């Protein structure tokens, strides 16, 4: 899947170095009435309170908001402390917007997982040693430092399990020619 990464990366953000580029996050914004413009101006303003590095969203797009490979503010210190990047799936109520969501969404993460040097596996392991794609929800159950349980509810209402979702994820980097 092709899309296309619009620069909208916020001014003033600090830039700490990662205890390791261990983990991709995956969120979704729990927002039923906000567009991935409107997220993209509150978290500008809000920074100091919370940011990722990209949003997906409005039929495909991707907004980044923060350079990967520096710490971002997006899932509790631990998670923050060995995050790659972190993104977040903006939500839609039509169908055919959603299909290119998700699959703009599932290729992103893949993408920057693949560019980390990190595995294509779906909430593995207990640690920070186990990379990976993590949702918010694996974050909170394992290191604590959040309680936020994304991005399966949202998932699950558009007919997409915790294994679907790790099955999507695998297809991306099974296509033939994603790699050496
Ligand atoms: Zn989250």
Known sequence: ?????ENKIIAGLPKGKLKGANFVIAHETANSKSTID??????????????????VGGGGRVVQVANVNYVSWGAGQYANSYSYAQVELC???????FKKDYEVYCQLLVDLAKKAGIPITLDSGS?????????????????GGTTHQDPYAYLSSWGIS???????????????????
């Open 1 to 5: 899947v092709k899309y296309t990464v």
């Open 38 to 55: 409107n997220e993209v101006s509150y978290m500008t303003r809000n920074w100091k309170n919370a940011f990722v590095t990209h949003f």
């Open 91 to 97: 939500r839609t109520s039509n169908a055919t917007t």
């Open 127 to 143: 640690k920070t040693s186990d990379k990976g794609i993590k949702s918010h929800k694996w974050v909170a159950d394992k290191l």
């Open 162 to 180: 915790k294994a679907q979702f790790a099955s999507d994820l695998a297809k991306v980097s099974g296509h033939h020619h994603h790699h050496h």
